[PDB]
Design a protein around this nucleic acid. Structure first.
Ligand SMILES: [Mg+2]
Ligand SMILES: [Mg+2]
Ligand SMILES: [Mg+2]
Ligand SMILES: [Mg+2]
Ligand SMILES: [Mg+2]
Ligand SMILES: [Mg+2]
Ligand SMILES: [Mg+2]
Lengths: 136, 130
RNA sequence: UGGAGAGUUUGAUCCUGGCUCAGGAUGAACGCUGGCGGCGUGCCUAAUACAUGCAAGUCGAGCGA
RNA sequence: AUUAGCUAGUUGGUAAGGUAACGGCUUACCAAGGCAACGAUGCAUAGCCGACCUGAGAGGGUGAUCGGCCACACUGGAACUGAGACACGGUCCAGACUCCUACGGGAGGCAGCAGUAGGGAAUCUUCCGCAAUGGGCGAAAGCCUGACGGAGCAACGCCGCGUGAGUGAUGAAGGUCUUCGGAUCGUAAAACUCUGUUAUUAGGGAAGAACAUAUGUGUAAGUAACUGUGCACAUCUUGACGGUACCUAAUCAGAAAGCCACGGCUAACUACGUGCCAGCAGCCGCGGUAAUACGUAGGUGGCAAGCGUUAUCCGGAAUUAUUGGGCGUAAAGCGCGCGUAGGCGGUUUUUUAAGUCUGAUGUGAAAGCCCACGGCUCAACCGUGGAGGGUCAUUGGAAACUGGAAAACUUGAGUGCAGAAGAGGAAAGUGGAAUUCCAUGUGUAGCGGUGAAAUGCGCAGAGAUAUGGAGGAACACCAGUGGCGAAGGCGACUUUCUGGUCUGUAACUGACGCUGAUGUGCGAAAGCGUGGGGAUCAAACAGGAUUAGAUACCCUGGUAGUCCACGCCGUAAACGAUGAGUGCUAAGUGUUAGGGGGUUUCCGCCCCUUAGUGCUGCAGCUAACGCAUUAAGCACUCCGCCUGGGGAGUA
RNA sequence: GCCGUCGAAGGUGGGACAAAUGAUUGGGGUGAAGUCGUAACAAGGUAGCCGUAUCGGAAGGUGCGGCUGGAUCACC
RNA sequence: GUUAAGGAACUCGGCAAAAUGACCCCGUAACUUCGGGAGAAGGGGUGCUCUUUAGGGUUAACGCCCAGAAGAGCCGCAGUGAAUAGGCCCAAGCGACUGUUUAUCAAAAACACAGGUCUCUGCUAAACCGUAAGGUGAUGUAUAGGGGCUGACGCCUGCCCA
């Protein structure tokens, strides 16, 4: 507004918040690295084999994996692709991005470098799922 | 109250052009006797008189129109009003409509136009546009 | 010298208004594939105890022996 | 600022001591100050600049290699030598840790160069070596140099470059689509023809090295080119890397190419399998019996030794808007006055140069972006020049506005005099009409209430009906668009005391202003505290029915409350849903209190000028509705507030 | 070698601020509405809404003030 | 009266004893009716001799009594060196408080209390003592007198009249 008021208080701009909460900050030090920052990726360790549904009008079935992350906290997940060589308490790489119409799930289990290593059943969409073909 | 009546003169320039009046009877002083006699030598007003008594003498304005009863003065914009002061750079004051108008500056020599400042590189307060 | 947009509230509009995408980036990670001439940059997370190597000497026209 | 006070040797003199010097620099008697709403003090986050990133720019986010400055050395103090260390590799002490000894004692500090261990989704050789440039020591040869000159390893980033082209119609084999009456990739493939950047063959072989040392004979002290130099050369000399950069000659077009997508956006389409399932998804979402929007082959598009996905940051986002927004109903104008600091201030002339203007000097070092070129075969990078910092200090000219300073000016603002209109307040009396309850009669079976009914009062004499007297509260008719106060609000009358506004202007000192962050004072009703008084209406409460059920709505009853005096609480659809102040711009028609032209015709009349008050209506503005001289129009000043909806005016 | 001023660490004691946690406990959003009623939007069938009291299983109902963002005939 | 090492293990129970104790200083929380908490807690110093200086009153003044500061020094195991003089803290229960009670087995959480209500009394008042006269209530008169219940202050006191 008035140039008198703008001297007396500047434009304190709009804060934003992260779309994906449970990563990427200095958390809660407890004389060791009790919890840390994972900007793109991490390890995991699993806790539960997941089976769930979307909720809005949709009626399909989905297979998450409710884990405890490497910084004491609890998140859901998802395995893209077909195969599932995963059981309880097995290491899984992470990468962010929510899943719409599921009520509370958080990230994608990377199908390349983990115990989630390689998914067969795919032949054209490949590097999104970690499937090889050394002929070409 | 009435703060900076120089804008109130240039308000009544816009008032009489809009409803297409002819005679404009406003009180004005030696600040504004320096003002409107710029544009008479630039092509906006038919005739500007002199103030009668230099304090309470009203300066009568008879505005200039076109042959088609078409408007000569498009609009007006104050620049340096009380609360934010604008002063001109050396050769870097801006142009009115790519040079087609008069930007009024009152430099350290008196009220001139923005054309006359580029022969002596002066600054001064950029008062109004056209 | 140089400055773009699209989608979605309604049976259908104009407006306010949020959220979302295309683009540029990384001393990035990770996903598939792999010919290099040549140029650069490679502890950013536990300030987690540091094997083995070398980094400060020189002077024999100081002066001893 | 959901942190307002803060230090006490703190602030100051004085004294002598104290370090390179000033010094509360550390101590001693007196002295009453420091800092602060212009952010003092206290918390959590942080090495900082030159530069990197994005952007039209203004700006936003970042602090890495690369240079300048700074601090620190497992942790916490304190020293010693010397030119100017509180010392990284020294040192005495104290603490938590490793490990050995004869258990009396001593040793150890890789945030030096690397390598291992460790939390990790994540960052490399334990490489010869001083030749060049730089540094200590010596008069010199030289000597130690993990500074550095370079190599060993990862698509880690940009750059350049190839996996070939010239020649080569009959739609050859053959894939999924098809009347498979047929198309597509496709001169593609199959052949034919040259080429060998690149490389599956070895070698001659850098300008990067100028010197130093003296020795070739020159500079003065040449006495003396031995010495410091090497001012003829520095010529018997100096290359790990490097049998490198380069380059020729060979059997050979033969080894040397992916990756994501293809509804709409958005660049790119077809046939089946599953068929609201395994899924997919940046949003619209495509999926209930294939489905151009899921896996598959064909096809295409993009980029290309690289393609996608993630998390993060800037642009898109005019979505924090100085350049560049908004408040009547969409988010947003305090419930409203007096008012301190503060912000802004009409006109005139004359100075001052504090801002502003331009001149001059010095400086804001390399290196980057850009503006250019020999060269690395171009290019990435190097080289030379060029622009790029001042809200700065200081050094002259100009006086136009904003500002301190001298003088008068009268439109704004204030008083004086001449006059009206008021429900503007505050104490005290006083008056009329209706409601309820008490006294008697005449009188008597009903009065009430309702869609219907009752519950109830009545026959012990109710209502009806008259005089009677007891109280308390409002203030019919005037009364209407009217009036008034800044708002909440104020309507019977009389009296004493008491504010403000307006009409006309001869007078009066002479800018004495507008806005107001905190502060402070009035606030409709309800509610509460301590006392009075209590007719009516009446939350709570009991009753009858309406209702399947009923505090509901309906009915006779009914207490706190309503009224006064005193002290508080301060909110509302506290509204014109429109903050104040000044000037401004087409016009018609009312109404109230005043003034201008008449014999003033009396609520006859028209003629005007000023201030409140309502209606209708151009230009303009607005999303539209609608404002529209009492603006939501054009501008100026200052204040308050908003930035998706809930969560929430909650904790 | 002893005495004294200054002096890290340690030990003693009452406080000050955040954080981790705790038997139960009070609202809040989320769903899927099965359970109990219709309180709004038509005059929503007792016209609604803002303050402020008091009562009820449940929206909510009544009292006293203000508002039209109150149909009919806009309540002449 | 004293006691090695330990310090409630004793016991119905820290019952009795032991420690704390004066003056002068620094410093002091929750909580609240803003007075209080508070001697809160936890801490330090004190003896004798010698040198200088600033403090009242008395008085012409030497003289006399009242005092407080720093500095220097001495001695003991110990300097209010003997006697006299509080232990403290956290959390609940009942009663608001100071008071008063079973002379002689019970001192309280019982009784009083300031305040809240409810009812009775128009003056030769009701009430009580006295067979009556006379008196108390009172030389007081509804802001005053007799009785019943509750027991400062705060927020409150719900339905039923067979
Ligand atoms: Mg070193
Ligand atoms: Mg190095
Ligand atoms: Mg009231
Ligand atoms: Mg009102
Ligand atoms: Mg005590
Ligand atoms: Mg206590
Ligand atoms: Mg008697």
């Amino acid at each position: 507004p008035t140039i008198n008021q703008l001297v007396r208080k500047p434009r304190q701009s709009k804060i934003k918040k992260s779309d994906s909460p449970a990563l990427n900050k200095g958390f809660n030090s407890k004389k060791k690295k009790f919890t840390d920052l994972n900007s793109p990726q991490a390890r995991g360790v699993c806790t539960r084999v997941g089976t769930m549904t979307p909720k809005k009008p949709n009626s399909a079935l989905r297979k998450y994996a409710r884990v405890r992350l490497s910084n004491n906290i609890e998140i859901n997940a998802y395995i893209p692709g077909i195969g599932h060589n995963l059981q309880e308490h097995s290491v899984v790489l992470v990468r962010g991005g929510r899943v719409k119409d599921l009520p509370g799930v958080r990230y994608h289990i990377v199908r390349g470098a983990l115990d989630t290593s390689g998914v067969d059943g795919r032949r054209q969409g490949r590097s999104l799922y970690g499937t090889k073909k050394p002929k070409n | 109250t009435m703060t900076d009546p120089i804008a109130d003169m240039l308000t009544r320039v816009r008032n009489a052009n809009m409803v297409r009046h002819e005679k404009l009877e406003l009180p004005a002083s030696n600040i504004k006797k320096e003002i409107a006699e710029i544009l008479k030598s630039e092509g906006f007003i038919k005739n500007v008189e002199y103030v009668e008594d230099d304090k309470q003498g009203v300066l009568r304005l008879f505005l200039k129109y076109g042959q088609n009863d078409e408007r000569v003065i498009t609009g007006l914009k104050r620049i340096s009003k009380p609360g934010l002061r604008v002063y001109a750079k050396a050769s870097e004051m801006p142009k009115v409509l790519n040079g087609l108008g008069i930007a009024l500056v009152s430099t350290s020599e008196g009220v001139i136009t923005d054309k006359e400042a580029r022969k002596r590189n002066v600054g001064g307060e950029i008062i109004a546009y056209v």
